[PDB]
């Protein structure tokens, strides 16, 4: 790997520089190099890994949606034929997005998840696994769509089971997991009622636990709670 000769601490330092410079592809390459050193990641380092790849795949998802929309319009009645180029280029972006998702899933499988024993690491990684299968599901159309969806569901479900047993209902990881599993239900799994029920129960159980929190923890939790509320407003 191109980062094999760089010190772990230098990779982490440069990932933070890349974040400041909004160089998310570099950030992701640095964090991949850090993961491949073989040591477990700290909380901050897990956040860096996620920030880096979320921004990379975010740009790809946004581009994919633009191109897919153009492609679908080209397939309407009365649309002039323009050749294979829209499909080809959508496929190019799609393949690169799938590559990034596969890279993240590979890091999680070799060997972040199997070494993660604490709830805060294990839930974070299983949520990521669900997320990157969800991003794969957004573009899936063939014989493996169902299996990709079930892989996302399975990872989210294992994360949910641990988070409910081991974390308070205000924990931001637990909240962000529930938020994302609810998005999965609504947007991927054709289960809007499950999405709404999960968002509401998650919000209400967190509300009831806010009284236990410091001012700073209250701010962290309410930020994610507001996203649940925003989704419920969109969906109801």
């Amino acid at each position: 790997g191109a980062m094999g000769s760089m010190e772990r601490a230098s990779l982490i330092q440069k990932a933070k520089l890349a974040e400041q410079a909004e160089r998310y592809e570099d950030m992701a390459a640095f964090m991949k190099g850090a993961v491949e050193k073989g040591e477990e990641l700290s909380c901050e380092e897990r956040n860096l890994l996620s920030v880096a790849y979320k921004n990379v795949v975010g740009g790809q998802r946004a581009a994919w949606r633009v191109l897919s929309s153009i492609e679908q319009k080209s397939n309407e009645e009365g649309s002039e034929e323009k050749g294979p180029e829209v499909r080809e280029y959508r496929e190019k972006v799609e393949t690169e997005l799938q590559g990034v998702c596969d890279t993240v899933l590979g890091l999680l499988d070799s060997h972040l998840i199997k070494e993660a024993g604490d709830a805060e690491s294990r839930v974070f990684y299983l949520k990521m696994k669900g997320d990157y299968y969800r991003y794969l599901a957004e573009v899936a159309t063939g014989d493996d769509k169902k299996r990709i969806i079930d892989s996302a569901r399975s990872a989210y479900q294992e994360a949910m089971d641990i988070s409910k047993k081991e974390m308070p209902p205000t924990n931001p990881i637990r909240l962000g997991l529930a938020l994302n599993f609810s998005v999965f239900h609504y947007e991927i799994a054709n289960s809007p009622e499950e999405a709404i029920s999960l968002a509401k129960t998650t919000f209400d159980e967190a509300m009831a636990d806010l009284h236990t929190l410091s001012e700073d923890s209250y701010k962290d939790s309410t930020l994610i709670m507001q996203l649940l509320r925003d989704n419920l407003t969109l969906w109801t």
């Binding site: 920030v51 931001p172 996203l227 989704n231």
Partner: peptide
């Protein structure tokens, strides 16, 4: 819909 921020607990 909104999904979680990357950086989280």
């Amino acid at each position: 819909a909104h999904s979680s921020p990357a950086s989280x607990q």
